[PDB]
Specification:
The structure is a monomer. By secondary structure, the protein is largely without helices or strands. The protein is extended. The protein contains no helices and no strands. This is Voltage-gated potassium channel KCNC4.
Length: about 30
Protein backbone atom coordinates (compact mmCIF):
# COMPACT_ATOMS: atom_id res chain seq x y z
CA UNK A 1 0.00 0.00 0.00
CA UNK A 2 2.53 2.69 1.08
CA UNK A 3 6.10 2.79 2.53
CA UNK A 4 5.88 -1.05 2.94
CA UNK A 5 3.70 -0.36 6.03
CA UNK A 6 0.44 -1.87 4.72
CA UNK A 7 -0.09 -4.57 2.04
CA UNK A 8 -3.41 -3.75 0.30
CA UNK A 9 -6.36 -5.58 1.96
CA UNK A 10 -9.25 -6.69 -0.31
CA UNK A 11 -9.47 -5.91 -4.07
CA UNK A 12 -10.49 -2.43 -5.35
CA UNK A 13 -14.23 -3.03 -5.88
CA UNK A 14 -15.79 -2.47 -2.40
CA UNK A 15 -18.96 -0.91 -3.96
CA UNK A 16 -17.25 2.53 -3.97
CA UNK A 17 -13.54 2.73 -4.90
CA UNK A 18 -11.26 4.72 -7.26
CA UNK A 19 -11.61 3.17 -10.72
CA UNK A 20 -8.41 2.76 -12.77
CA UNK A 21 -10.15 3.54 -16.12
CA UNK A 22 -11.90 6.58 -14.55
CA UNK A 23 -9.23 8.47 -12.54
CA UNK A 24 -10.19 11.99 -13.76
CA UNK A 25 -13.23 13.16 -11.71
CA UNK A 26 -11.70 15.77 -9.32
CA UNK A 27 -10.95 13.17 -6.60
CA UNK A 28 -8.83 15.83 -4.78
CA UNK A 29 -10.28 18.62 -2.57
CA UNK A 30 -12.88 19.86 -5.12
Amino acid sequence: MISSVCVSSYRGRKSGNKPPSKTCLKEEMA
